[PDB]
Amino acid sequence: TKSIKDYEDQKILSWEKEVEDSSQDKLKQTLLCKDENDLIKVNFDPSLVRLLKEVKYFLLLRLEVPTTAKDIYTKAETYRTQIVALDMIVDNYNHIK
Q1: CA 48/CA 83 separation, integer angstroms
Q2: Count of Cβ atoms closer than 10 Å to residue 69 Cβ
Q3: In sequence order, what DSSP letters do the residues of the chain get, joined into one string?
Q4: What is the CA radius of gyration of the chain?
Q5: Alpha-carbon distance 20 to 54, whole Å?
Q6: 54: alpha, beta or left, given left = phi > 0 and alpha = psi -120 to 50?
Q7: CA distance 6 to 16
Q8: Distance between CA atoms of 50 and 52, rounded to whole angstroms?
Q9: Do residues 55 and 69 make contact, with C-beta atoms less than 8 angstroms apart?
Q10: 24, 41 contact by CB (below 8 A)
Q11: CA-to-CA distance for 84 and 37, rounded, in angstroms?
Q12: At what angle do helices 44-60 and 67-95 cross, to 10 degrees?
């Protein structure tokens, strides 16, 4: 049993040693870099869902989530709120082409 616990702890540490960042200065469609396909050049593009599933997994499996991840997730939710809909404008701009 002690061995098994050690295995769990080692895998958990190896996985836990990771960080993220969601800040962005290109919040807008960077149109002028591609042709008729606006690029919303943003760090929260996959980071929101990755952090949500990560925090969900850790919580559901009773693992302490570091404060860095918790803060970034509290930001990620507020972001997702509007990111679910920015796709409307980007799709409209790309399809009108």
Answers
A1: 9
A2: 19
A3: -HHHHHHHHHHHHHHHS-------S--SEEGGGSSS--EE--THHHHHHHHHHHHHHHHHTT-PPPHHHHHHHHHHHHHHHHHHHHHHHHHHHHH--
A4: 18
A5: 12
A6: alpha
A7: 15
A8: 6
A9: yes
A10: yes
A11: 19
A12: 140
The backbone region for 7, taken as left when phi is positive above 0, alpha when psi lies in -120 to 50, beta otherwise, is alpha
Residue with tokens 């960080």: 19
Neighbours of 61 (CB within 10 A): 8
Experimental method: cryo-EM
Amino acid making up residue 60: L
Give the rounded distance of the alpha carbon of 88 from its chain centre.
20
Query: What does the alpha-carbon distance between residue 82 and residue 95 come to, in Å, rounded to a whole number?
Result: 21
- At what resolution in Å was this solved? 8.0
Phi, psi angle pair for 39, to nearest 5°: -100, 115
